[PDB]
């Protein structure tokens, strides 16, 4: 039963999973001045010219695109990682304004949103056993902020009115991931985990600098979506995010200046 209520919202959730209170959690704030460069990260490879999408599902807390990680098609390697990382599903954090949505904060700003694109270290087999090591899972983490319309997300936006609420489903064959990445690939890297129960410590997060713009129109789709089911009454999806937890022994590492 947890969620982004009063009730159940973030600050309950350690009662059920105490590891909300660990040593390497996340989201959390970037602190730009303090990060510091490492001229030794090695380059950064987004491999999704054979990505392959099937589904999007809203599961009552964010909407996920659903991608087939059966094979070696859509990959995430470089940077900080070892090994190969494959493209599972991508969702976002958003809020009720444009003022508030992302997880990741940068100076203590806050951006209108941010897409999570979660892959698993390819050495554990499945995505079961990836969440329980501590380098299973790499994230990419983009900003969202309002001005300009996304093309690449416009496909998204419009088929989100046949997902309305918790537990639909719709296909979502064909679309391609590329068209959601900023211009550079320049970012911060720390050790952290989930955003949402189980909140295990298992993410090498990578945080993309640049944001990617979207439209006022684009984010007020998002904001009509439900967190309820069908015949339910009707509670908007909006403020699904966690905010930002003590950075405790981390570093933040950039892969800039
Ligand atoms: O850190 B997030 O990317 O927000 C969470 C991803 C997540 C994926 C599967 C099960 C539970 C959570
Ligand atoms: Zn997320």
């Given at each position: 039963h947890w969620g982004y209520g009063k009730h159940n919202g973030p600050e309950h959730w350690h009662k059920d999973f105490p590891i909300a209170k660990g040593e390497r959690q996340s989201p959390?704030?970037?602190?730009?001045?303090?990060?510091?460069?490492?001229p030794s990260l090695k380059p950064l490879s987004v491999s999704y010219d054979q990505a392959t999408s099937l589904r999007i599902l809203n599961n009552g807390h964010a909407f996920n695109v659903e991608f087939d990680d059966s094979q070696d098609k859509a990959?995430?390697?470089?940077?900080?990682?070892?090994?190969?990382?494959?493209?599972?599903?991508?969702?976002?954090?958003?809020?009720?304004?444009?003022?508030?949505?992302?997880?990741?904060?940068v100076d203590k700003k806050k951006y209108a949103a941010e897409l999570h694109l979660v892959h698993w270290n390819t050495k554990y087999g499945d995505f079961g056993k990836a969440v329980q090591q501590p380098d299973g899972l790499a994230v990419l983490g983009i900003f969202l902020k309002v001005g300009s319309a996304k093309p690449g997300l416009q496909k998204v936006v419009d088929?989100?009115?046949?997902?309305?609420?918790?537990?639909?489903?719709?296909?979502?064959?064909?679309?391609?991931?590329?068209?959601?990445?900023?211009?550079?690939?320049?970012?911060?890297?720390?050790?952290?985990?989930?955003?949402?129960?189980?909140?295990?410590?298992?993410?090498?997060?990578?945080?993309?600098?640049?944001?990617?713009?979207?439209?006022?129109?684009?984010?007020?789709?998002?904001?009509?979506?439900?967190?309820?089911?069908?015949?339910?009454?009707?509670?908007?999806?909006?403020?699904?995010?966690?905010?930002?937890?003590?950075?405790?022994?981390?570093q933040i590492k950039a892969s800039f200046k």
């Open positions: 959390v704030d970037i602190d730009t001045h303090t990060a510091k460069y490492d990959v995430l390697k470089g940077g900080p990682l070892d090994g190969t990382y494959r493209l599972i599903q991508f969702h976002f954090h958003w809020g009720s304004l444009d003022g508030q949505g992302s997880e990741h904060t088929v989100l009115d046949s997902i309305k609420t918790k537990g639909k489903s719709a296909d979502f064959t064909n679309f391609d991931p590329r068209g959601l990445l900023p211009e550079s690939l320049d970012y911060w890297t720390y050790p952290g985990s989930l955003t949402t129960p189980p909140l295990l410590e298992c993410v090498t997060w990578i945080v993309l600098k640049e944001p990617i713009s979207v439209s006022s129109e684009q984010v007020l789709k998002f904001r009509k979506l439900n967190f309820n089911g069908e015949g339910e009454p009707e509670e908007l999806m909006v403020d699904n995010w966690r905010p930002a937890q003590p950075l405790k022994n981390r």
